Amino acid sequence: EADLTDWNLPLAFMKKRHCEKIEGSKSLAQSWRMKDRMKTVSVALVLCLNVGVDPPDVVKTTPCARLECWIDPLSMGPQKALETIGANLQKQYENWQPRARYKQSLDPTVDEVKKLCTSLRRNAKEERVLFHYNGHGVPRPTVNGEVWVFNKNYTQYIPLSIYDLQTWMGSPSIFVYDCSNAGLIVKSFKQFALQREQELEVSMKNCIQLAACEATELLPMIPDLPADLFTSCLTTPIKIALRWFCMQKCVSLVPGVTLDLIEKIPGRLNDRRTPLGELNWIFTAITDTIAWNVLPRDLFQKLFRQDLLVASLFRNFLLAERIMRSYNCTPVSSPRLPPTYMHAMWQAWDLAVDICLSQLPTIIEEGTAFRHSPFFAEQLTAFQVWLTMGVENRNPPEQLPIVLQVLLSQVHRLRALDLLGRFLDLGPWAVSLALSVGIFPYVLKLLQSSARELRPLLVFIWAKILAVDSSCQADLVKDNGHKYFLSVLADPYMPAEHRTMTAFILAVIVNSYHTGQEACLQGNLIAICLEQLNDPHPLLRQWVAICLGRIWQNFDSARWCGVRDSAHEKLYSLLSDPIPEVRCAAVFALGTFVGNSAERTDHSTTIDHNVAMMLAQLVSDGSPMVRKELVVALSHLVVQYESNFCTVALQFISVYTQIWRVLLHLAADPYPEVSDVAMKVLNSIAYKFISATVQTGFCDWSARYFAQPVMKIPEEHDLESQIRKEREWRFLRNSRVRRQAQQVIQKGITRLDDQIFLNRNPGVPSVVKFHPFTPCIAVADKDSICFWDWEKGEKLDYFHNGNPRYTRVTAMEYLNGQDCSLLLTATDDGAIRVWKNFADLEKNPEMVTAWQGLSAGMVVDWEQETGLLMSSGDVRIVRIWDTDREMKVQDIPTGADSCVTSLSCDSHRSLIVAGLGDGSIRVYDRRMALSECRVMTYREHTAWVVKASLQKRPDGHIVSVSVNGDVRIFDPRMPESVNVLQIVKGLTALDIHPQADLIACGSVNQFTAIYNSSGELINNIKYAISCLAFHPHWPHLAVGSNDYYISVYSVE
Amino acid sequence: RVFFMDDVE
């Protein structure tokens, strides 16, 4: 079939740089940064336990609840018990915040609490101070807002107003209450805060309260539980959680588990490899997960991420709420947390605890080996399952804090980093979420590890983070992670993708940051980039060049280091790189290297002149982006040498003159954006301030690549994608068109006198081009380009090509005719420009790319299969532009004084033919050397060859017709004409059809002869015919007279 | 830091 031909055709000017506008992605407002770091410098422990005496308010039962801080006061005497309980509570709090000035109070008086709290506030005026109160041995707080403590003789409970309590305290403080009606305490505290606010007109959010109960509720009196329950949940969550689990009906599933066995559990809270440490780690992960999923982001950051002690207190407060809900008790906190007792992660906590302590009897008795709990592995499996179809921005995964927790240890660190990288690959929103959870400090600390397997995952994660948020450069420089990145970049064995990842990271670090630039200079980044400059990887070279450019941006020491290393000479090689992106990056780097001369010795002037003359040969460049970067580099040159450029400009109203000529060339650029930038740069020179400096968005546009996902399969490879189905339908339509055309041609050619339509144009139809498949004909006028249809018969579009009055659209072509077609329009001065969306309903005319070619009119011959483009005209040179590399590949010499009137080529062979004004028809073979490119030169005409077109068949027959009108069919293997014909004495225009041998000619007397290769008379249509065009597939012909009328003819 | 990253070299 004819489908394989369409599929294996490169799509010229169809890439990211052509479709997407070259601009930087706007940086989002990254609020993941922690505003301030509070510290609990001191903790106050007020324990009004009243050991040995029961409060009158509550009549305790005979067994009662005698356990305070896991200590039985009645066994060891009153004073000794109180001291031991105070010490044990200090130890339990030190378990969470070891570095704090703990000052215990054992049954204190009002003045004693006054002195304690005032001294602590004087010690820490602006840092958090924890106040811990135990009202188990004193009467309940009253509605009036008072707290009961002891007098000197311990004969009566003297009250203590909460107003005075918070007057002695300060605004930065957290309060933990363990009383019966602690809700009354919280309500009175808030009422006093409101009273203070009312008085202030003529410390509410800052102070945090944790309360054991609501105002109405009473503490539980069950003998099994400790009397000190809320503090046991807050300070020793794992022990109380296991004790509470061993009291539920879930124990029935696991026989042989008792509180006596829990008392003898092995391991410590710190060693995560031990069962107790594993349980503590799992509890931390689950509580953090519940807090993250339930609480809002702002409250989660304020509570569970500000400081260690408050975060731990609230993580244990979740467990306190869950435990005390079952005893008709509701803990109260100053910021009202939404209820978390029903969260689904508590079931996972129960299952994990069950699995962990189901092995406990064997550990205790048989002394077996403790197998690690599969909790984290299963949670990471769930995270992976979410990521499998997590492309859509659905509800965020519940396992992000679990990923953060499992990042801490090394047992599953590599898998956690892999999953985190896969998640950050999803997009900027995923990176923002991960930074909001608080992975940044831990990923930053991970850079200290010397494990070589972590390097790819870490560089991937850091590249994503820096692509999203660029403010991390200061933190990376502070922690010396740039040393880690330099070590990554200096390993040839590393895969190239991670090396370009690290190159991007280093480019972002040094981006407009003098500290980072100096740090990387002292890290020998220049040499590292230079050694990896000629690497066979386009993106690696591009980002190495960008990093080199950003290193010496306003940095004279970096420029000196580059000069010593001959960085400019080595960077000159990238200016000829086939990839346009690398050329643009090299131009950016060279311009930035120029822009920081700062008046050094004559060697600096010489090297600036050398770089300028090396960049001044890059004007003849296909890529408008690279030319814009060249304009920016030349603007840097101008800023460096403003006085010399002013003198040069005033001279005409020898190095700077050449740069001025280059800028003038760039000013009259076909691409509007390059022309505008060059014009602005030139105007900045005449009136001679810093505001004239303009920076292009190429660097940020390149950095946008790392924001987009990379791992997932591209949309083109998707077989069931809509785009591929549309392309398949288009190719099916093209195959049908070709088959129908071949069937029509097989039936012969009858007389063609059918006039499909007759219209009027605003301008003279100069060149008419048929779209091969869709029913669109592109007619170019002097100052416009119309697109008519021969089915609907309506004017679709009316462009302005942009060429000046003297110029004229001479040649035209349809790039990518099979699908997603472009329109190439070459003016007679050299300007070649490509149009997109030229016949669309919901899209406006669009200019893809443009570049001044060369520098009869201008003749163009597109070659879709090889991707090359040959332009010719008045010059004695035939240029061969390659749209893939966007650079001129060959310039074969015409070797004749007359202009190239026509140009055509044979597919699958190098048989570039060219009609000439003098009459000769030269043929060129680009396989051989330039001096041997010329193959044959036969001169049997003296007139402008109207069209020396060629036949696509293997037996190519150059049908060359001059103004004299004498047809001479030539062959590439015979130096003499095979067939000679004479048609019209005065000929004006003609066209040839490759499939059907139909030579359509013009005439001054309105005649239009459509003859055959044999010269047989077929049709003499009676109406200067200056534009004829044949449909490449159908036997259609377009006739446009000197009058602005267009017609399309067909055979029945 | 809120948590304790261990085994970091």
Residue numbers in the entry:
A (entry chain E): 18 to 219, 236 to 686, 806 to 840, 950 to 1116, 1125 to 1292, 1303 to 1331
B (entry chain G): 399 to 407
Paper text:
pmcMechanistic target of rapamycin (mTOR, also known as mammalian TOR) is an essential serine/threonine protein kinase that responds to nutrients, growth factors, and cellular energy to promote cell growth. mTOR nucleates two distinct complexes, mTORC1 and mTORC2, each characterized by specific subunits, targets, downstream signaling pathways, and functions. mTORC1 contains mTOR, regulatory-associated protein of mTOR (RAPTOR), and mammalian lethal with SEC13 protein 8 (mLST8). RAPTOR binds mTORC1 substrates, including the well-characterized substrates ribosomal protein S6 kinase 1 (S6K1) and 4E binding protein 1 (4E-BP1), through a five-amino acid motif termed TOS. RAPTOR binds the LST2 TOS sequence to present LST2 to the kinase catalytic site in mTOR for phosphorylation of LST2 S670. mTORC1-dependent phosphorylation at S670 leads to monoubiquitination and stabilization of LST2.
